Ligand binder design. Structure first.
Ligand code: CLA
Ligand code: CLA
Ligand code: CLA
Ligand code: CLA
Ligand code: CLA
Ligand code: CLA
Ligand code: CLA
Ligand code: CLA
Ligand SMILES: CC(/C=C/C=C(C)/C=C/[C@@]12O[C@]1(C)C[C@@H](O)CC2(C)C)=C\C=C\C=C(C)\C=C\C=C(C)\C=C\[C@@]12O[C@]1(C)C[C@@H](O)CC2(C)C
Ligand SMILES: CC(/C=C/C=C(C)/C=C/[C@@]12O[C@]1(C)C[C@@H](O)CC2(C)C)=C\C=C\C=C(C)\C=C\C=C(C)\C=C\[C@@]12O[C@]1(C)C[C@@H](O)CC2(C)C
Lengths: 210, 41, 165, 217, 194
C-alpha cells in the first residue's frame, strides 16, 4: 500500500485496492473485491447503486421538503412508501412494462460498454452521433456530460461522486429502516429528532417500541 | 499394555464384546419400543 | 379383505384374546396388595399388553378367525392395501444390515490379505481397521454396485476346482 | 486446502488432480464412496443433477412461499400444491406422470448416453441438425450450448467460481429440501411458517422442543 | 453481412456474409456445424414463408369480417358448414383433413427429395425476379426479413390471444383505444404480479 487515505489510520490495508478506483480508502474487511474480476464488477455495481440511490434520496426528500414547505402537487403529502398505491394516468402495470423495456435497452447498452469498452459509443440510427472515444465503463461522457465537465477536475469529481453516492446509499438504507421501524416519513423523523434529540435516539425509540 | 489390548482384540474377546453390544442394543430397543411386530412408526 | 382376513380392529376374536390375556394378568394381580412389587410388575405388564394390542390394531394388521395378526409377504398386495411395513419394508431394512455385515467382513478380509500373516489378523482382530470399515460400510449398496460394475467383486477362474472340473 | 474437517486426513482419492478439479472438493468422503474414479465421475454427475433439481425445487417452494406470506401470491404449501394443482388441471396425475416420464426419460437417456461416452450425442444425423449443439463441453455435467444462453461459461476467469457457486448453493438446497421434509413431518406447518415460529421464540421453538426429534429430551 | 444485431458484438465466424439475413445472431451457437447450418437456413425460410402466409391470412380473415384466426376452425367442432369469403364449402373436417394430408404429403415429399432446395427458380419464379444477381440477393434479404417479422407476428398472435382472448386487429384496436391501459403489462397473464 501507500500513504493514501484509509478507513482506519494505521490499519494494514489489503493492497489490491491501490487508489485506481474512486473512493479507495481500503475498506474491504470481508475481502469481497479480492479477485480483480469481482472488483471490476463491484466498481460498476457501486457506481450504479450509488447513482440510483442519490436520485432516490433526492426524489424522497425534495418532495417531502416541497410538501412541508407548502407547495402544491397532486402527489404532495403522499409518502415515498405510499406512492405506488397512488393513482396516475396509467396503472403501475404499464409503467413497469415500459420501464423494463426502456431499461432493458439502456442497461444492455451499458453492459455492452462494460463487456467491450468502446462499443456502445454510437447510435443505432444517427451514426453522426457518437460518444467520445477513450471513456471508461461507468463514465460514458459526451451527451452524458453536456455541461462541459471532465476536462480537468475528474479525480476530484469521481471521489465526490462516490462519496455522495455512498452517503445516499446509506440514506436510503436509513429510509427503509426508519419507515419500517418508525412507520413515518424520513424528514418527519428528522423533525422529531430535532424536537428533543435526547429522548428520540434509535436506542430510545426501539426500547420504547418493544 | 500393548499385549493386554492385543488379547482383548482376540476373536473370542472381540466376539463377546460385540455380541454383548448387539444384544444390549436389541434389548434396549425392545425395552423402549416393546413388541415391534411391524414397521409402522 | 385380502385373503378372507379381517382387520384386527374389526375382529372380535382379537378383542377376545386381549380381554383373555388381561383376565389372566388380573387374576394374577388379585393375589397381591395394592402397590406391591408384583402388583407394579403386573400393572406394567397389563399396560404393555393393552398398548401392544392397540398398536397392532392401529398398524392396519389383518387378523384371521383366531384373532391373530397375519402378515402379507407379497409386494403388490402389501403395497396396494398398506401392509408394506409387515414384510416388505423390513425386507430391505434387513438386507441393508446384512449386506453391511457381509461387506464389512469382506473389506476386512481383503485388507488383511496383504499382511505377512493374514491368519493372525483374523484370530486377533485389527480393531482400528475393523472399526474404520464398520463405519464406512454404511454405503455398502453403492460401493457393492460400483464394485460389481468394475468386474472386481468377482474373482475370475483362479478359484480352485476338483479334477472333474 | 479448504477441508471440511481442518485436521482430518483427506482421502487420497479426493486429493488427486482428477478430483481437485471437481467443484466443491472439501475432502468429504468419510464412507469412501468415490474411491473408484469412475464411481466418482458418476457420483459427481449425480451430485450436479441432484443439486440443480433441488435448487429449482427449493426455489419453487420457498420463493412462492415467501411471496404468499407477503401477499404477492396464494400458492398453497408445497405438501398441498399437488392436490390443489391437480384439482384445477386438465389431466389426471397419472397421465401427467406418464407424459412427464416419457419427456424426462428421453432427455435423461440422452444425458445418460453422453455420460457413457462424452460428446456422443453430436453424432451427425441423430437429431435434425440440433445434435450439433448436443456435444456438451470438455467438462461432463456442464453441457453448455443451448443450455447456456447468456454465455457465462465462455470466460475461463469466472468458471471455477461459477462451478463452486452452483455446487454450494445446490448442496445447501438439497439440505433445504431434506429440511422441508423433516420439518413437515415434525411440525405440520410450512417452511416459512417454521422460520417465523423460530424467529418469534427461538429458545423454545426448535427441533429440541418438538416431540419428534429428541424423544429422550 | 447485413447488420450486427448487437452493435459492438463481432460476428460469429461460422455465419458466412453471403447468407441472406446474416446479422451475426447465433448466441447459442446452433449453426456452428455447416450441415446443421444448411438445414437451419432452409427451415428458416420455410418457417418464414409459412408464417408470412399465416399472418396474411389471420389479418385478412379479420380485416374482411370473417372473425379471427383462432375461431375459424370452430366450424368442425361447434357444428359445421365451413366458409371461405362467406362462400360455404362442401367439405367436412375428415374430407379436407385427408386431402390436406395427401396434397401436402405430395408437395413436401417433392420438396424433400430435392435435398436442400430453398430457392427453386422456374415453376416457382414465373415473373422472373430472382436469377442469382444483385436483385436476387437483395430480394432474398427482403424475403427472410419479412419472414422473420411474420414469425414474430404469429408468435404475437398466439401469445396475445392466449393472454387476452382477442384477435390481432381487436387487440390493436384495444391498444389504440388505451395504449397504457391495454398492453401486455395490463393483462393478468404476461407480468406475474400486478
Ligand atoms: C429368523 C427368524 C426370526 C424372525 C424373522 C424374527 C423376527 C422378530 N422377532 Mg423373533 N425370535 C426368533 C427368530 C426370529 N424372530 C428366535 C429364534 C427367537 C428365540 C431366541 C425369537 C424370540 C423373540 C422374542 C422373545 C421376541 C422376538 C421379537 C421379534 C421381532 C423383533 C422386532 C425388533 O426387535 O425390532 C427392532 C427394530 C429395528 C429397526 C432394529 C434393526 C437393527 C438396526 C438397529 C437398524 C439399523 C439402524 C441404523 C442404520 C444403525 C446406525 C448405526 C448404529 C450403531 C447407531 C420380529 C418380528 C420381539 C417381538 O416383539 O416380536 C413381535 C420379541 O419380543 N423374537
Ligand atoms: C438447509 C438448512 C436449514 C435451515 C436454515 C433450517 C432452519 C430451521 N429448521 Mg430445519 N432441517 C434441516 C435444514 C435446515 N433447517 C435439515 C437438513 C433437517 C433434517 C435433519 C432439518 C430438520 C428440522 C426439524 C426436525 C426441525 C427443523 C426446524 C428448523 C427451525 C429451527 C432450527 C432447529 O430446530 O434446528 C434445525 C435442526 C437441525 C437438525 C439442524 C440441521 C441444519 C443443517 C445441518 C444445515 C444448516 C447448518 C448451517 C451450517 C448453518 C445455517 C445455514 C443457514 C444460514 C442457511 C429453522 C427455521 C424446527 C422447526 O420447524 O422449528 C420451528 C424443527 O422442528 N429442522
Ligand atoms: C429515481 C426516481 C424514481 C424511480 C422516482 C419515482 C417517482 N417519483 Mg420522484 N424524483 C426523483 C427521482 C425519482 N423519482 C428526483 C431525482 C426528483 C427531483 C424527484 C421529484 C419528484 C416529485 C416532485 C414527484 C416525484 C414523483 C414520483 C412518482 C411518479 C413519477 C411520475 O409521474 O413520472 C414523472 C415522469 C417524467 C418523465 C417527468 C420527469 C421529467 C424529466 C426532466 C425528463 C425525463 C414515482 C414514484 C411524484 C409523486 O410522488 O407522485 C405520487 C411527484 O410529485 N418525484
Ligand atoms: C426501487 C424500487 C422499489 C422499491 C424499493 C419499492 C418499494 C415499495 N413499493 Mg413500489 N414499485 C416499484 C419499485 C419499487 N417499490 C416499481 C418499479 C413499480 C412499478 C411502477 C412499483 C409499484 C408499486 C405499487 C403499485 C405498490 C408498490 C408498493 C411498495 C411498497 C410495498 C410494501 C410492502 O411490502 O407491503 C414498498 C414501499 C405498494 C405500496 O406502496 O403500498 C403501501 C403498492 O401498492 N410499488
Ligand atoms: C445516512 C445516514 C443517516 C442519517 C443522517 C440518519 C439520521 C437519523 N436516523 Mg437513521 N438510519 C440509517 C442512516 C441514517 N440515519 C441507516 C443506514 C439505518 C439502518 C440501520 C437507520 C435506521 C434508523 C432507525 C431505526 C432510527 C433512525 C433514526 C434516526 C434519527 C435519530 C438518530 C438516531 O436515533 O440514531 C440512528 C443512527 C443510526 C442508525 C446509525 C447510522 C449511522 C450512519 C450509517 C452513518 C452516519 C454518517 C456520519 C458518520 C454521521 C452523520 C454525518 C452527516 C449526515 C451530518 C436521525 C434523523 C431514529 C429516528 O427515527 O429518530 C426519530 C430511529 O428510530 N435511523
Ligand atoms: C415371488 C413371486 C411372486 C408371486 C407368486 C406373486 C404373486 C402375485 N402378485 Mg406379486 N410381485 C412379486 C413377486 C410375486 N408376486 C415381486 C417380486 C414384485 C415386485 C415388487 C411384485 C409386484 C406385484 C404387483 C405390483 C402386483 C402383484 C400382484 C400379484 C398377484 C397377481 C399375485 C398374488 C398384483 C396384485 O396386487 O394382485 C391382486 C399387483 O398389482 N405383484
Ligand atoms: C445425493 C446427493 C449427493 C451426491 C450424489 C453427492 C456426491 C458427492 N459429493 Mg456431495 N453433498 C451433498 C449431496 C450429494 N453429494 C449434500 C447434500 C451435501 C451437504 C451436506 C454435500 C456436501 C459435500 C462436500 C462438502 C463434499 C461433497 C463431495 C462429494 C463427492 C465425493 C463423495 C462421494 O463420492 O460420495 C457419493 C455420495 C453419494 C452417492 C450419496 C449417497 C447418499 C447416501 C447413501 C444417503 C445419505 C443420507 C443422509 C445421511 C441423510 C461426490 C461427487 C466432496 C467433493 O466435492 O469432492 C469432489 C466434498 O468435499 N459433498
Ligand atoms: C423442480 C421445479 C419445480 C416443480 C416440479 C414445480 C411444480 C409445481 N409448481 Mg412451482 N415453481 C418453480 C419450480 C417448480 N415447480 C420455480 C422455480 C418457481 C419460481 C419461478 C415456481 C413458482 C410457482 C408458482 C408461482 C406456482 C407454482 C405451481 C406449481 C404446480 C403446478 C405446475 C404448473 O404451473 O404447471 C406446469 C407449468 C408449466 C409452464 C409447464 C406444481 C406443484 C403453482 C401451484 O402450486 O399451483 C397449485 C403456482 O401457482 N410454481
Ligand atoms: C433433488 C432434491 C429435491 C428436489 C425437489 C423437488 C423436485 C421439489 C419439487 C416440489 O416441491 C416443489 C418444487 C413443488 C411441490 O408442490 C411439488 C414438489 C414436486 C414436491 C433433493 C435432493 C436431496 C438430497 C440430499 C439431501 C442428499 C444428501 C446427501 C448427503 C448428506 C450425503 C452425504 C454423504 O454422501 C456424502 C456426500 C459423502 C459420504 O462419504 C458421506 C455421506 C454422509 C454418506
Ligand atoms: C416464432 C418462430 C421462431 C422463433 C425463433 C427464434 C426466436 C429463434 C431464436 C434463436 O435460434 C436463433 C435465431 C439463434 C440462436 O443462437 C438463438 C435463438 C434465440 C435460440 C417461428 C414461428 C413460425 C410460425 C409459422 C411457421 C406460422 C405459420 C402459420 C400458419 C400456417 C397459420 C395458419 C393459420 O392462421 C391461419 C392462416 C388461419 C387460421 O384460421 C388457421 C391457422 C392454421 C391457425
Amino acid at each position: 500500500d501507500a500513504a493514501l487515505p484509509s478507513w482506519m489510520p494505521g490499519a494494514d490495508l489489503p493492497g489490491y485496492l491501490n487508489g485506481t478506483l474512486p473512493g479507495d480508502f481500503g475498506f474491504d474487511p470481508l475481502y469481497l473485491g479480492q479477485d480483480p474480476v469481482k472488483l471490476k464488477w463491484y466498481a460498476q455495481a457501486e457506481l450504479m447503486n450509488a447513482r440510483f440511490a442519490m436520485l432516490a434520496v433526492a426524489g424522497i426528500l425534495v418532495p417531502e421538503l416541497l410538501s412541508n414547505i407548502g407547495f402544491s402537487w397532486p402527489g404532495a403529502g403522499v409518502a415515498w412508501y405510499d406512492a405506488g398505491k397512488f393513482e396516475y394516468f396509467a396503472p403501475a402495470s404499464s409503467l413497469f412494462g415500459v420501464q423494463m423495456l426502456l431499461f432493458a435497452w439502456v442497461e444492455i447498452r451499458r453492459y455492452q460498454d462494460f463487456v467491450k469498452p468502446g462499443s456502445a459509443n454510437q447510435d443505432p440510427i444517427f451514426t453522426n452521433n457518437k460518444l467520445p472515444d477513450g471513456n471508461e465503463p461507468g463514465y460514458p461522457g459526451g451527451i452524458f456530460d453536456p455541461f462541459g465537465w471532465s476536462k480537468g477536475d475528474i479525480k476530484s469529481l469521481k471521489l465526490k461522486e462516490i462519496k455522495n453516492g455512498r452517503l445516499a446509499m446509506l440514506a436510503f438504507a436509513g429510509f427503509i429502516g426508519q419507515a419500517y421501524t418508525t412507520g413515518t416519513t424520513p424528514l418527519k423523523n428528522l423533525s422529531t429528532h430535532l424536537a428533543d434529540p435526547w429522548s428520540t435516539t434509535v436506542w430510545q425509540n426501539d426500547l420504547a417500541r418493544l | 499394555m500393548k499385549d493386554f489390548t492385543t488379547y482383548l482384540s482376540t476373536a473370542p474377546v472381540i466376539a463377546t464384546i460385540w455380541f454383548t453390544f448387539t444384544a444390549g442394543l436389541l434389548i434396549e430397543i425392545n425395552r423402549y419400543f416393546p413388541d415391534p411386530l411391524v414397521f409402522s412408526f | 379383505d385380502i385373503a378372507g382376513l379381517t382387520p384386527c380392529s374389526e375382529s372380535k376374536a382379537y378383542a377376545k384374546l386381549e380381554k383373555k390375556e388381561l383376565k389372566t394378568l388380573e387374576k394374577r394381580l388379585k393375589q397381591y396388595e395394592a402397590d406391591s412389587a408384583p402388583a407394579v410388575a403386573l400393572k406394567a405388564t397389563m399396560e404393555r399388553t393393552k398398548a401392544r394390542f392397540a398398536n397392532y390394531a392401529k398398524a392396519g394388521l389383518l387378523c384371521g378367525n383366531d384373532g391373530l395378526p397375519h402378515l402379507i409377504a407379497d409386494p403388490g398386495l402389501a403395497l396396494k392395501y398398506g401392509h408394506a411395513g409387515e414384510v416388505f419394508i423390513p425386507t430391505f431394512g434387513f438386507l441393508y444390515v446384512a449386506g453391511y455385515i457381509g461387506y464389512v467382513g469382506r473389506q476386512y478380509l481383503i485388507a488383511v490379505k496383504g499382511e505377512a500373516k493374514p491368519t493372525d489378523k483374523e484370530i486377533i482382530i485389527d480393531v482400528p481397521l475393523a472399526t474404520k470399515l464398520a463405519w464406512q460400510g454404511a454405503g455398502w449398496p453403492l460401493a457393492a454396485v460400483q464394485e460389481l460394475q468394475r468386474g472386481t467383486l468377482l474373482e475370475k477362474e483362479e478359484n480352485i476346482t476338483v479334477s472333474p472340473r | 486446502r479448504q477441508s471440511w474437517l481442518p485436521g482430518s486426513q483427506i482421502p487420497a482419492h479426493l486429493d488427486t488432480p482428477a478430483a481437485q478439479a471437481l467443484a466443491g472438493n472439501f475432502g468429504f468422503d468419510p464412507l469412501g464412496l468415490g474411491k473408484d474414479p469412475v464411481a466418482l465421475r458418476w457420483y459427481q454427475q449425480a451430485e450436479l443433477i441432484h443439486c440443480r433439481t433441488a435448487m429449482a425445487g427449493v426455489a419453487g417452494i420457498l420463493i412462492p412461499g415467501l411471496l404468499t406470506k407477503a401477499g404477492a401470491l396464494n400458492v398453497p404449501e408445497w405438501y398441498d400444491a399437488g392436490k390443489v394443482a391437480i384439482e384445477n388441471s386438465f389431466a389426471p396425475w397419472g397421465s401427467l406422470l406418464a407424459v412427464q416420464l416419457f419427456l424426462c426419460g428421453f432427455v435423461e437417456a440422452k444425458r445418460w448416453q453422453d455420460i457413457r461416452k462424452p460428446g456422443s450425442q453430436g453424432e451427425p444425423g441423430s437429431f435434425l441438425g440440433f445434435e450439433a449443439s448436443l456435444k456438451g463441453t470438455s467438462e461432463l455435467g456442464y453441457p453448455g450450448g443451448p443450455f447456456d444462453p447468456l454465455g457465462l461459461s465462455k470466460e475461463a476467469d469466472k468458471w471455477a467460481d461459477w462451478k463452486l457457486k452452483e455446487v454450494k448453493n445446490g448442496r445447501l438446497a438439497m439440505l433445504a429440501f431434506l429440511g422441508f421434509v423433516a420439518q413437515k413431518y415434525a411440525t405440520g406447518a410450512g417452511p416459512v411458517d417454521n422460520l417465523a415460529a423460530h424467529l418469534k421464540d427461538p429458545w423454545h421453538v426448535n427441533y429440541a422442543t418438538n416431540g419428534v426429534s429428541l424423544p429422550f429430551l | 453481412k447485413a447488420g450486427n444485431w448487437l452493435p459492438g458484438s463481432d460476428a460469429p465466424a461460422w455465419l458466412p456474409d453471403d447468407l441472406p439475413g446474416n446479422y451475426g445472431f447465433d448466441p447459442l451457437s446452433l449453426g456452428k456445424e455447416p450441415a446443421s447450418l444448411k438445414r437451419f437456413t432452409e427451415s428458416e425460410v420455410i418457417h418464414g414463408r409459412w408464417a408470412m402466409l399465416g399472418v396474411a391470412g389471420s389479418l385478412a380473415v379479420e380485416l374482411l369480417g370473417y372473425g379471427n384466426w383462432y375461431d375459424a376452425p370452430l366450424w368442425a367442432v361447434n357444428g359445421g358448414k365451413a366458409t371461405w369469403f362467406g362462400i360455404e364449402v362442401p367439405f367436412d373436417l375428415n374430407a379436407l383433413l385427408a386431402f390436406e394430408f395427401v396434397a401436402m404429403a405430395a408437395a413436401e415429399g417433392q420438396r424433400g427429395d430435392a435435398g436442400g432446395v430453398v430457392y427453386p427458380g422456374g415453376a416457382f419464379d414465373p415473373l422472373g425476379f430472382a436469377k442469382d444477381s444483385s436483385k436476387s440477393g437483395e430480394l432474398k434479404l427482403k424475403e427472410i426479413k419479412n419472414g422473420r417479422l411474420a414469425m414474430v407476428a404469429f408468435l404475437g398472435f398466439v401469445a396475445q390471444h392466449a393472454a387476452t382472448g382477442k384477435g390481432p386487429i381487436a387487440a390493436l384496436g384495444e391498444h389504440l383505444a388505451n395504449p397504457w391501459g391495454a398492453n401486455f403489462a395490463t393483462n393478468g397473464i404476461s407480468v406475474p404480479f400486478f
